[PDB]
Amino acid sequence: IVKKKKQVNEDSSDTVLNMIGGDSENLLAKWGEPSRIEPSAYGYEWWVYNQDLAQYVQFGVAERKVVTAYVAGEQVKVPPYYINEKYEDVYKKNPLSHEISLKRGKNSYQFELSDTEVMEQPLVPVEDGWAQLYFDHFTHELVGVRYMDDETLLRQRPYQLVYSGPLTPDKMKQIENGNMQQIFDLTNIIRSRHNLPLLAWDQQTADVAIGHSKDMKDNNYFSHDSPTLGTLGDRLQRGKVGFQLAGENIAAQHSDGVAALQGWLNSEGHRKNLLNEQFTGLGVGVYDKFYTQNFIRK
Ligand SMILES: [Cl-]
Ligand SMILES: [Cl-]
Ligand SMILES: [Cl-]
Ligand SMILES: [Cl-]
Numbered sequence: 001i002v003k004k005k006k007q008v009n010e011d012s013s014d015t016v017l018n019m020i021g022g023d024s025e026n027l028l029a030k031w032g033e034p035s036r037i038e039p040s041a042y043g044y045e046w047w048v049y050n051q052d053l054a055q056y057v058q059f060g061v062a063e064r065k066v067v068t069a070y071v072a073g074e075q076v077k078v079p080p081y082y083i084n085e086k087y088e089d090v091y092k093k094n095p096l097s098h099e100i101s102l103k104r105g106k107n108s109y110q111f112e113l114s115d116t117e118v119m120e121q122p123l124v125p126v127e128d129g130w131a132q133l134y135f136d137h138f139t140h141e142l143v144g145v146r147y148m149d150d151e152t153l154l155r156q157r158p159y160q161l162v163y164s165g166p167l168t169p170d171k172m173k174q175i176e177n178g179n180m181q182q183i184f185d186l187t188n189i190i191r192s193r194h195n196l197p198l199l200a201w202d203q204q205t206a207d208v209a210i211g212h213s214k215d216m217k218d219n220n221y222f223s224h225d226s227p228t229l230g231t232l233g234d235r236l237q238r239g240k241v242g243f244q245l246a247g248e249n250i251a252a253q254h255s256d257g258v259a260a261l262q263g264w265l266n267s268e269g270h271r272k273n274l275l276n277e278q279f280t281g282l283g284v285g286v287y288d289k290f291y292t293q294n295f296i297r298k
Contacts, residue, residue: 015077016057016069020147021128024064031059038178039171041256042155044068046178050185053192058182060152068152070258071145072189078145081133087119087140090133096122100130100159102150107164109154117159120266132158134262143193143265144186146258156255176286179257180206183284183293186261187274194275199282202296208239209285209292212250217290222252236294245297247273252290260291 014030027047034047044060044067054075060068074083081090090096100111100123113122124131130153134144148156167175188198212235215226225231229238232248249270254260264270273279279295286292 019066024061039174041175067149069147085142110162111159113159179286180284183257202281202283204241205283205294208235209283209294213285213287213290213292243296247295249293
């Protein structure tokens with residue numbers, strides 16, 4: 001199927017960026033009811049629109065105001081850019097800075113981006129806010145856009161920050177569950193982008209992954225091998241998961257699942273698991289800021 005894209009009139013529909021700063025009633029009117037609503041670790045709730053992977057967007061709502069959004073769908077409008085745009089073309093239209101300065105009240109903040117951050121996830125100012133531009137540095141293409149107001153940027157802290165001067169355990173579990181499903185869906189966006197079959201969610205595998213994330217946090221290590229609970233294979237077997245093949249990606253300390261997954265996409269070893277056509281299933285387990293993907297073939 002090849003559709004005609006002919007156009008003679010400006011499209012009157014609001015963009016994701018146009019929603020930032022507007023109220024939730026406006027978001028509900030323009031976008032409809034989200035698929036899922038789940039808490040974040042930063043005071044906003046995510047309203048997730050994931051039923052069409054080509055249109056994937058999630059909006060963050062705090063006190064009935066839209067404060068952030070993350071765009072992953074290939075067809076979602078992100079002017080002056082487009083999802084898939086080459087880094088050289090993105091830069092040229094608005095050179096990307098290594099330093100970002102802002103103020104709240106009488107305090108001063110200066111983010112210092114590393115050379116890697118400038119190439120993988122630079123920041124550009126937008127009317128009343130910011131856009132974090134997530135790239136796949138191996139293909140040099142724009143793969144996501146995170147819009148944030150000033151308050152959200154300071155909470156997320158995506159880069160090193162120079163400046164002036166309470167979640168319950170059950171809320172934490174809800175936040176972790178959100179990070180797990182976002183990583184899952186956004187991994188399938190990557191699979192689709194790379195012409196690979198999508199992965200099926202496996203709950204028993206996800207439970208194994210959660211246990212690993214918790215073990216790393218509790219026992220102060222970061223490895224595929226648990227000093228007390230063994231290898232990936234040992235863990236999956238213990239969780240009653242049979243498999244023909246397995247793989248694992250681990251991450252720690254990223255702000256959220258979106259950030260962890262972009263770290264994996266931009267690392268050769270982790271990317272190999274994301275792009276392995278042999279895998280059929282995926283369970284994701286998150287415990288605080290420890291994120292684990294367990295991929296399986298069955
Ligand atoms: Cl038209
Ligand atoms: Cl759109
Ligand atoms: Cl991060
Ligand atoms: Cl690498």
